Amino acid sequence: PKIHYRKDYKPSGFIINQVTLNINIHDQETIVRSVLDMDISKHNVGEDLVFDGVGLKINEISINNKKLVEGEEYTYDNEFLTIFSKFVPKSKFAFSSEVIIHPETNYALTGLYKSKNIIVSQCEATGFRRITFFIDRPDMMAKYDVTVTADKEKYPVLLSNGDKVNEFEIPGGRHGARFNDPPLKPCYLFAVVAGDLKHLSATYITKYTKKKVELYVFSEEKYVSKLQWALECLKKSMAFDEDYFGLEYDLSRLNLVAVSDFNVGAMENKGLNIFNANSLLASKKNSIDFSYARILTVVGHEYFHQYTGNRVTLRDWFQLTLKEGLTVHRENLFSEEMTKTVTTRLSHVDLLRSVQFLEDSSPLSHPIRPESYVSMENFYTTTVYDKGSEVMRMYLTILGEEYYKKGFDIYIKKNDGNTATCEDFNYAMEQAYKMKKADNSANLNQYLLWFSQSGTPHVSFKYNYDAEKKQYSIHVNQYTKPDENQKEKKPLFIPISVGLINPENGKEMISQTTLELTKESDTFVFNNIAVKPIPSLFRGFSAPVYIEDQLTDEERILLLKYDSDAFVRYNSCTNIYMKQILMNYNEFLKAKNEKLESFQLTPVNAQFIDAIKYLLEDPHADAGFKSYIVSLPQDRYIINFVSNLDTDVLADTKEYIYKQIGDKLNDVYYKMFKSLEAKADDLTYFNDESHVDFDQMNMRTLRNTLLSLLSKAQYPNILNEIIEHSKSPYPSNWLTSLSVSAYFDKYFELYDKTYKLSKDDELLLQEWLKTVSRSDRKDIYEILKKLENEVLKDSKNPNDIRAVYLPFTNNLRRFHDISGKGYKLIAEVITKTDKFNPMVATQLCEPFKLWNKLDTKRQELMLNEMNTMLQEPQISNNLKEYLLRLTNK
Ligand SMILES: CC(C)(C)OC(=O)N[C@H](C(=O)NO)c1ccc(-c2cccc(/C(N)=N/O)c2)cc1
Ligand SMILES: [Zn+2]
């Protein structure tokens, strides 16, 4: 297993100036002819000419139109094509080859493959080598001339990068299309699409140069009615980059294409963005509410790549976070601006502190710029993406909006058209930092540690207030636990957005302030503070850290009710919950360990419950925010704070706490559920696909959250509501009716009803599968078997497989069954999947990421299944490398 180190980057000894492709698609095979106009670089030392090439069937390879002979002129081991230096020209030459590939049987969805009746490519990161020979790395920039030929009635629409410069008929019912793309690009941005595609279209006129841009969104004919929202999102995306960053699109046309089989959400191929259907297609009748935020995010994300990734590209894959962290950040700014709801920011903090914090304390922990990799197909992590985005966001927090826009523009203008590294971005940010602090001595050298240091920092606080002096002090400390990446952790540049709240009237006591913590510890002093304040710390979650506020629950309740920052309120509620959870947890744990016949539990803080009621009953309070405060922290967030977690005890803890709050607030819950119905389920714009109300969807979220709480509590005659709910036109509602009916005998009745509603829409059925998978059923294992036999079968669609199993793995009490049958089940699915799609197989490994955090019994159970998987003879390099690192081998 070859290990690539970041320190070992060297430019190639070769140059590829021009690529000329002929891709001829037939039913049983695809013939790929390629001419590479190449040259010798200044770093050449007379080495062999080595091309990447995986799974290629060689018909003929040549140098300068002279046929090459296999044996003494070249060798091919199905991974590398080696041409011995003796036969490699000393100056400009042409390499050519013809290979046969097989998209119809390519189930790994990398390279060229067939998704239902659409031929589609996916080349990032190392997929182009599966199509033809190439030096498959992002710093090999080349021009592209691409011709695609196929059967006309099966594949009337042909697409590739650049301008379509020719269309022509071919004897035998075939046709061809030529695409020339003069600007240089890395090969991972190459794309080709063929199929019977239908489209929606629009023309966008850019803000400053008034350039006309054609916008096309494609899908199969059956789902062409689900394309409208996507087109709107694209328009919104183009406008935002124009308005915020002053950046326009530079090409004449942009195509968006949905396919049913895709490993991730989407891909940013130049002028030809390719989407997982679930991240591009939606209609109000056939999609749940989450689809609309999802499409906005993903469409936006791939668009923003056009600058941060496509025009300014990567030198090497170790710089991945430079285009991904930055593009996610750009997407967050976009989505927060589009939704105008505080839950947008809250949701991505919620995801970070759950999933990413878990990864960062796991054996898989890595910095956002790793020092090494084996399998590139394991490189695209929540750390690189989501922690990366938070690191990119901190630049904005530190600099402020004005100087950030300055710094960002410096980055774009200086690096446009060439490759870049993380240092290039920090440099640009540093220039703005100098201008902001008004001295060229200031620097951001320490900030670079955010790129190299792994692990989540802990930030803790202590306070002093001198009433006579009117002087307030915040003593801050930071620490990162040592791991396998750094034995010794260094202090980071941590920006702490703070406010001081007067507890007597809830007013701000100081102006907007961002504390710059650059040492292991510091003391921040504030003068003329009239009264002892309650500190509002890390507003907007200004740094990706563990926040230890050391506040009393009384202080937290006061912030929850009266603070101005949405995150700090949400975090205060979170912190109150966590304290309660930890307390009830080893009360239950002690009772179990000591086998007590009787024991006591500490009740939920009564004033806390009162504060929740206060906020819920406030008509001006945000519905989305409301849904968060009545929900306990994610299981994967809680696990970060408990050693040897007994999942049964945690389940009992959550049950007690939910019941405690329910016993006091169920009447309030029911009252709100009924009073919210009118506005939440308003059908006024149900048939307007371009009208999306994120506030209204948040109202539905609240109703479905409340209904779930009421159903679990067996609230009087709540089954009546559930039945009525199932008749709602909104899928979010009638799918909710299915899941909440799990606590009643009408479950399988709604099972059949909702299935009949879902079965004729590919994406809707997958949402139905998710709903069933996450149903709180005691017979969930029997139900899964039913899904496998009657619906899933031997589908290789990643959307189907993920829908059936992933939500189930979040069933705390059932997936972590002490028999280990849950671990056994998913491991079977992983091994089965690994035989045709190694990438999705590692995705299915996610439940195991916390294995060393559980109780000793469940640790062993999980470790056994992982070792069983590791011992599969046909295990992929992909899965093997992942499980080896996860199990510390
Ligand atoms: C949700 C979000 C937009 C953040 O991520 C994606 O939907 N896709 C990411 C991305 O950065 N898009 O711009 C993504 C992640 C991994 C990959 C990827 C990496 C390595 C291999 C493959 C591949 N060949 N899949 O079949 C795919 C492609 C896109
Ligand atoms: Zn991306």
Side-chain angles (χ1 to χ4, degrees), residues 1-9 11-56 58-68 70-85 87-209 211-439 441-467 469-503 505-589 591-619 621-823 825-859 861-879 881-889:
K2 184 52 167 48
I3 300 165
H4 305 80
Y5 296 91
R6 183 176 62 93
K7 72 183 74 180
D8 292 336
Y9 173 78
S12 173
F14 303 97
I15 315 266
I16 302 169
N17 291 320
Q18 179 76 52
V19 180
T20 307
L21 296 183
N22 281 268
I23 302 169
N24 306 131
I25 302 170
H26 299 269
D27 301 288
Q28 304 287 87
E29 64 186 6
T30 287
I31 316 299
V32 176
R33 305 187 296 256
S34 172
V35 175
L36 303 183
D37 292 308
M38 298 185 56
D39 199 346
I40 308 303
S41 84
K42 56 175 182 277
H43 303 92
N44 190 274
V45 290
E47 68 270 38
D48 296 338
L49 177 51
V50 181
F51 289 108
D52 301 290
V54 179
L56 306 186
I58 297 181
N59 274 0
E60 166 188 27
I61 77 170
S62 315
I63 291 192
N64 295 320
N65 292 127
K66 178 204 147 67
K67 201 173 185 294
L68 263 49
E70 200 283 330
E72 186 277 335
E73 286 195 318
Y74 79 87
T75 59
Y76 181 52
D77 65 342
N78 204 36
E79 183 177 1
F80 303 106
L81 179 68
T82 304
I83 305 170
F84 310 104
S85 61
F87 311 94
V88 179
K90 301 294 197 302
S91 59
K92 285 191 174 181
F93 65 97
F95 174 85
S96 57
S97 67
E98 178 180 292
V99 298
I100 301 186
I101 54 182
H102 276 64
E104 64 275 8
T105 58
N106 186 5
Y107 304 129
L109 312 191
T110 67
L112 190 66
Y113 66 96
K114 193 180 174 195
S115 174
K116 266 201 273 195
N117 289 330
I118 301 168
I119 304 290
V120 57
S121 63
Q122 170 59 36
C123 291
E124 186 176 18
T126 57
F128 189 74
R129 66 187 65 178
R130 295 176 175 271
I131 302 182
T132 189
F133 294 110
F134 206 80
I135 309 184
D136 198 347
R137 42 188 273 176
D139 57 342
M140 299 295 295
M141 308 282 297
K143 312 170 62 161
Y144 281 75
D145 189 328
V146 182
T147 296
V148 191
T149 71
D151 175 87
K152 191 176 184 66
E153 100 251 22
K154 299 165 75 87
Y155 304 103
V157 171
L158 302 177
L159 298 172
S160 190
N161 318 87
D163 318 293
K164 183 170 56 179
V165 295
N166 193 28
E167 302 177 299
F168 56 97
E169 299 295 305
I170 296 180
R174 298 174 63 83
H175 70 325
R178 186 179 184 181
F179 292 82
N180 196 27
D181 191 21
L184 296 172
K185 69 165 172 289
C187 63
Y188 79 88
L189 287 182
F190 165 85
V192 59
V193 174
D196 194 10
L197 307 179
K198 306 304 182 179
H199 70 265
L200 290 188
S201 184
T203 298
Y204 191 93
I205 306 179
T206 65
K207 193 172 186 176
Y208 306 102
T209 63
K211 176 183 179 64
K212 259 176 187 99
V213 183
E214 286 182 290
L215 309 180
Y216 286 83
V217 291
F218 293 92
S219 72
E220 62 174 290
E221 180 179 345
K222 182 179 176 180
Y223 301 118
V224 71
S225 67
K226 304 176 70 176
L227 281 169
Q228 298 172 52
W229 177 233
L231 182 53
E232 301 292 340
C233 293
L234 184 54
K235 295 178 187 170
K236 286 171 141 69
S237 302
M238 303 180 70
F240 182 80
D241 226 6
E242 287 178 338
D243 298 343
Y244 193 100
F245 291 105
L247 306 174
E248 333 174 288
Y249 196 66
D250 52 334
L251 311 183
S252 314
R253 175 165 169 163
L254 175 52
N255 307 285
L256 312 189
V257 181
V259 293
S260 295
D261 305 270
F262 212 72
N263 287 343
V264 294
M267 178 59 204
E268 73 265 20
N269 316 286
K270 238 160 153 178
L272 186 50
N273 299 348
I274 293 166
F275 293 76
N276 187 322
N278 67 15
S279 299
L280 193 69
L281 307 189
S283 74
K284 290 182 177 177
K285 188 191 178 183
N286 305 131
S287 303
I288 62 173
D289 291 348
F290 171 63
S291 286
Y292 286 89
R294 174 64 177 183
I295 290 167
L296 184 66
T297 285
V298 177
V299 168
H301 184 106
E302 310 309 337
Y303 178 77
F304 294 137
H305 262 313
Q306 181 65 9
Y307 271 91
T308 56
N310 291 5
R311 286 173 66 155
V312 183
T313 188
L314 303 183
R315 183 193 81 174
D316 54 78
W317 286 124
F318 296 97
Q319 320 297 324
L320 183 61
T321 196
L322 170 61
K323 80 177 175 84
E324 294 305 341
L326 187 53
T327 296
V328 176
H329 168 59
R330 274 151 60 66
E331 177 275 309
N332 289 167
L333 298 178
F334 169 67
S335 291
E336 286 174 43
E337 181 64 30
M338 292 302 103
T339 64
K340 291 295 187 180
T341 61
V342 297
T343 58
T344 299
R345 173 62 181 161
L346 292 183
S347 73
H348 165 22
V349 169
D350 205 85
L351 266 172
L352 183 87
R353 295 204 301 186
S354 57
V355 175
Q356 197 280 320
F357 277 15
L358 190 156
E359 183 169 88
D360 227 348
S361 65
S362 80
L364 292 171
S365 176
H366 56 280
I368 64 178
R369 178 163 73 173
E371 291 300 326
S372 66
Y373 66 81
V374 177
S375 185
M376 263 308 302
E377 272 162 355
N378 286 332
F379 207 78
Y380 292 69
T381 60
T382 178
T383 290
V384 170
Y385 274 65
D386 302 311
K387 174 170 175 175
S389 64
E390 294 299 293
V391 168
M392 287 301 175
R393 185 185 183 273
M394 274 188 296
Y395 283 121
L396 171 57
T397 305
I398 291 165
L399 292 174
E401 188 176 283
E402 181 183 335
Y403 282 95
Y404 176 74
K405 290 185 184 179
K406 285 187 196 293
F408 186 91
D409 193 67
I410 290 179
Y411 170 71
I412 295 299
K413 297 289 186 297
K414 183 165 195 167
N415 301 281
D416 191 16
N418 206 12
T419 59
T421 68
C422 292
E423 287 87 353
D424 290 324
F425 191 83
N426 196 64
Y427 172 80
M429 294 295 117
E430 185 172 273
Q431 303 317 116
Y433 190 65
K434 294 180 177 303
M435 299 189 295
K436 182 180 187 282
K437 289 306 179 66
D439 67 315
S441 68
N443 72 92
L444 298 178
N445 274 2
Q446 182 187 19
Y447 197 91
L448 288 175
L449 288 177
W450 280 113
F451 291 95
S452 63
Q453 183 166 289
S454 64
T456 311
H458 299 242
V459 178
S460 55
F461 294 87
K462 276 175 174 63
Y463 318 100
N464 198 78
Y465 175 69
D466 196 293
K469 285 179 160 79
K470 309 299 183 301
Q471 190 177 72
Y472 184 68
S473 304
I474 302 178
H475 179 68
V476 190
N477 187 278
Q478 72 165 288
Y479 158 82
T480 300
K481 210 182 313 303
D483 53 26
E484 304 290 344
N485 294 309
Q486 287 92 24
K487 169 188 171 184
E488 164 172 16
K489 301 287 181 179
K490 289 165 174 159
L492 305 170
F493 194 119
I494 302 180
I496 313 180
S497 296
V498 296
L500 295 179
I501 298 300
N502 189 331
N505 58 17
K507 287 285 210 308
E508 306 286 332
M509 298 186 69
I510 65 178
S511 299
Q512 169 183 7
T513 308
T514 301
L515 309 180
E516 296 181 0
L517 179 66
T518 57
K519 295 184 292 188
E520 162 190 342
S521 73
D522 214 339
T523 287
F524 299 92
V525 187
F526 301 89
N527 282 327
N528 299 317
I529 303 304
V531 77
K532 182 183 181 178
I534 300 181
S536 181
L537 304 160
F538 289 101
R539 289 186 162 177
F541 191 62
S542 66
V545 302
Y546 285 110
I547 302 167
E548 295 155 18
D549 60 19
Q550 306 287 5
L551 299 179
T552 70
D553 283 346
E554 288 71 32
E555 289 175 310
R556 288 167 174 162
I557 286 160
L558 209 150
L559 284 174
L560 175 58
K561 291 177 69 178
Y562 301 112
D563 195 8
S564 62
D565 186 76
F567 165 74
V568 176
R569 297 177 70 200
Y570 153 88
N571 198 37
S572 298
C573 182
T574 296
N575 291 338
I576 292 169
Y577 270 136
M578 280 307 305
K579 179 182 169 188
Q580 182 70 23
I581 289 170
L582 292 183
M583 178 56 63
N584 288 149
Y585 177 85
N586 347 255
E587 282 167 346
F588 272 119
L589 175 63
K592 180 180 188 170
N593 285 345
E594 298 173 358
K595 299 176 181 298
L596 300 184
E597 289 301 327
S598 66
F599 62 100
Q600 286 154 66
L601 294 167
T602 304
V604 174
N605 186 304
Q607 289 70 63
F608 175 53
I609 295 178
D610 280 331
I612 298 175
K613 180 172 180 291
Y614 170 86
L615 296 179
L616 289 184
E617 288 181 341
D618 184 11
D622 182 84
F625 183 81
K626 288 184 181 184
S627 67
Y628 276 96
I629 74 178
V630 298
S631 306
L632 264 65
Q634 294 273 317
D635 291 342
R636 286 180 294 206
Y637 176 82
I638 298 167
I639 188 110
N640 286 321
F641 305 93
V642 179
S643 310
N644 297 327
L645 179 105
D646 190 314
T647 51
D648 274 318
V649 177
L650 176 55
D652 290 343
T653 296
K654 294 172 54 182
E655 182 181 64
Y656 169 69
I657 295 174
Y658 270 119
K659 187 61 162 57
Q660 279 268 301
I661 303 180
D663 284 343
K664 293 199 175 189
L665 299 190
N666 275 343
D667 287 338
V668 175
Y669 291 169
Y670 182 75
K671 179 185 182 68
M672 291 179 52
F673 175 82
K674 299 302 290 176
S675 65
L676 281 166
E677 178 174 347
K679 288 179 183 173
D681 295 346
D682 177 30
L683 289 168
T684 297
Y685 300 106
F686 188 83
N687 277 122
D688 191 334
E689 266 312 313
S690 296
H691 184 98
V692 180
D693 191 327
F694 288 92
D695 288 322
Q696 181 185 7
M697 288 189 299
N698 273 351
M699 293 178 187
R700 292 206 278 275
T701 297
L702 184 51
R703 291 194 79 230
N704 291 322
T705 298
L706 291 180
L707 180 58
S708 181
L709 292 173
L710 292 169
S711 302
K712 169 62 181 178
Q714 296 289 280
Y715 193 77
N717 309 322
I718 196 64
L719 183 54
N720 287 328
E721 261 69 25
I722 297 172
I723 293 301
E724 285 309 298
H725 210 55
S726 74
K727 303 167 181 177
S728 179
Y730 290 108
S732 290
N733 286 339
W734 56 260
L735 280 182
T736 289
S737 74
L738 174 54
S739 54
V740 302
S741 72
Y743 305 110
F744 295 93
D745 55 7
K746 282 198 166 303
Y747 176 72
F748 283 118
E749 168 183 306
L750 291 185
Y751 181 101
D752 296 338
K753 175 182 169 72
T754 55
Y755 170 77
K756 291 164 62 181
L757 290 172
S758 306
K759 69 180 188 306
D760 297 321
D761 185 293
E762 165 185 293
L763 295 186
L764 185 57
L765 178 54
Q766 289 163 2
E767 291 305 325
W768 179 84
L769 288 177
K770 289 182 186 175
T771 302
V772 170
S773 184
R774 67 180 172 85
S775 288
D776 192 6
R777 293 288 296 185
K778 300 171 179 295
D779 57 343
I780 186 57
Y781 280 94
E782 288 65 47
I783 295 178
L784 288 181
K785 227 68 167 176
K786 182 176 169 66
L787 286 187
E788 295 169 340
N789 294 332
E790 302 185 9
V791 180
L792 177 59
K793 302 195 200 303
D794 287 334
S795 170
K796 301 180 194 292
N797 191 325
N799 283 3
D800 293 337
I801 300 173
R802 290 184 288 233
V804 172
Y805 294 110
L806 279 183
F808 156 73
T809 64
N810 289 313
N811 192 320
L812 187 63
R813 203 182 285 279
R814 299 294 180 251
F815 168 70
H816 292 282
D817 187 287
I818 201 54
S819 70
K821 64 168 163 180
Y823 309 154
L825 175 63
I826 296 303
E828 283 172 2
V829 180
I830 293 161
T831 294
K832 178 192 207 285
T833 300
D834 190 44
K835 306 170 178 311
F836 62 85
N837 195 324
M839 188 166 180
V840 172
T842 62
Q843 288 176 357
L844 291 166
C845 284
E846 184 180 1
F848 292 110
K849 292 178 75 177
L850 45 65
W851 72 270
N852 63 341
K853 307 301 186 190
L854 309 177
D855 61 84
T856 57
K857 180 61 186 182
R858 284 181 175 85
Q859 287 193 39
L861 293 177
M862 275 192 172
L863 187 56
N864 168 70
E865 297 296 337
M866 287 188 290
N867 284 328
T868 298
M869 287 188 296
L870 273 171
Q871 288 171 355
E872 288 290 339
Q874 306 302 295
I875 190 174
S876 66
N877 298 316
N878 205 323
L879 182 57
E881 191 254 1
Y882 191 77
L883 294 178
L884 279 184
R885 280 191 294 122
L886 182 53
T887 60
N888 269 318
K889 293 188 179 69

